[PDB]
């Protein structure tokens, strides 16, 4: 669906703007962490590309990524907000309803990206694995990973990316 492609374009640009604004990001900022390899196990027509919008302050990055995702979702027709709990369950093993999604994605991000296995991961080059992705035949679903330069920040990006690629099914 084109609800997909134009919504990920909206959210990939809300991310970018908010990181610049709230975290003083730039594409001319030497990243601490670098997205190395990018791997789709079962790829049925998706391209993932990485975009560098790095910055020092990783909690600024987490809140900026929360703000973008709050908005983008709240900017959904109630009919298409209806489909979001199903993506939650399929990607994060979490149960939710439309009125609950914001607090529940919220509470998952800071549990998961404040955990010690994320915050204390200081390995420079980090890869991203997604299980599956489908695109329209002649229309590749084009996704963008926004590398924030931190491990705490990419953790929130990747979770969005997990929900998104599950939407393509």
């Amino acid at each position: 669906a084109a609800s997909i492609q134009t919504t990920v374009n909206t959210l990939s640009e809300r991310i970018s703007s908010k990181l610049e604004q709230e975290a003083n990001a730039s594409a001319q900022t030497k990243c601490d962490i670098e997205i190395g390899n990018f791997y789709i196990r079962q790829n049925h027509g998706c391209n993932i590309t990485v975009k560098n919008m790095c910055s020092a302050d990783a909690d600024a990055q987490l809140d900026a990524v929360l703000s973008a995702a709050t908005e983008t979702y709240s900017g959904l027709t109630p009919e298409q907000k209806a489909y979001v709990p199903a993506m939650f369950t399929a990607a994060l093993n979490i149960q939710t309803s439309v009125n609950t999604v914001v607090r529940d994605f919220e509470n998952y991000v800071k549990q998961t990206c404040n955990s010690s296995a994320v915050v204390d991961n200081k390995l420079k080059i980090q890869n991203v694995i997604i299980d599956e992705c489908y695109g329209a035949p002649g229309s590749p679903t084009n996704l963008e990973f926004i590398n924030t330069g931190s491990s705490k920040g990419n953790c929130a990006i990747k979770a969005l990316m997990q929900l998104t690629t599950k939407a393509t099914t």
Epitope: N24, S26, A27, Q28, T29, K30, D32, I33, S55, A56, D57, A58, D59, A60, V119, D120, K122, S150, S151, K152
Partner: antibody
Framework: QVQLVQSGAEVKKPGASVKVSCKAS????????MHWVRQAPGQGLEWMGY????????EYNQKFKDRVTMTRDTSTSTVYMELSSLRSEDTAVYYC????????????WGQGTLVT | DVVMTQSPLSLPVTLGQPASISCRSS???????????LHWFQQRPGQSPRRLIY???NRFSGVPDRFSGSGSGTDFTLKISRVEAEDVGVYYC?????????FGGGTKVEIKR
């Protein structure tokens, strides 16, 4: 107005360890990277590495990959630096520097710390 | 690694006259992103470093316009148009394109007599 306070001079015996430090002031700590440069007596500068204070990420010069351990303290705005196994050549001044917003230029230097 | 060579090592300069210092690199310093990450610093005698020029030509806040920088690729030049007694000192060039960041060996500027 940005300000970088460093600890005073030191004299260690060959093979031991020392810890310099670097209290900061005047800017949001976690928003800027902190470097560390050493200058031998009557010698040019030499880059040791940096630290991100929001996260702890570090990146050392290989010359001291096993001997330096840059550290932070989000509460006291203080960036430490421990050189272990001090040799005779390790005697020098040690400045800490703040970065711009791209981690590409040194915008604020400290004052110095002569360790010998 | 990137080796920076500064030349000359010593520069007696008549008060009020121009002056030029040179910096060469063992590898090009033009980054993929378009910028060249070369910079100059002044060290007043025994004091600590003091900012000067960044990215070949731009000057930090509170930096006299007599200071000025130029060059391209792998050979760069700094120029003090008129040399006041406060400009005595060692000038260092640095690069930050290639980790680790590296500095040249310095040039000493002194008034001539």
């Amino acid at each position: 107005q940005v300000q970088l306070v460093q600890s005073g001079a030191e004299v260690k015996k060959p093979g031991a360890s020392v810890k310099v430090s670097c209290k900061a002031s005047g800017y949001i700590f976690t928003r800027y990277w902190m470097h560390w440069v050493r200058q031998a007596p009557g010698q040019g500068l030499e880059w040791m590495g940096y630290i991100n204070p929001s996260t702890g990420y570090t990146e050392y010069n290989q010359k001291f990959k096993d001997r330096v351990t840059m550290t932070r303290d989000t509460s006291t705005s203080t960036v430490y630096m421990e050189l272990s196994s001090l040799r005779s050549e390790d005697t020098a001044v040690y400045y800490c520097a703040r970065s711009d917003y791209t981690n590409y230029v040194f915008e604020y230097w400290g004052q110095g710390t002569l360790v010998t | 690694d990137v080796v920076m060579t500064q030349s000359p090592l010593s520069l007696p300069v008549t008060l009020g006259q121009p002056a030029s210092i040179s910096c060469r690199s063992s590898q090009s310093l033009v980054h993929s992103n378009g910028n060249t990450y070369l910079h100059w610093f002044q060290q007043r005698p025994g004091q600590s470093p003091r900012r000067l020029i960044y990215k070949v030509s731009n000057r930090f806040s509170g930096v006299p316009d007599r200071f000025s920088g130029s060059g391209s690729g792998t050979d760069f030049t700094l120029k003090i148009s008129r040399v006041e007694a406060e400009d005595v000192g060692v000038y260092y060039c640095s690069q930050s394109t290639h980790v680790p960041y590296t500095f040249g060996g310095g040039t000493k500027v002194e008034i001539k007599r």
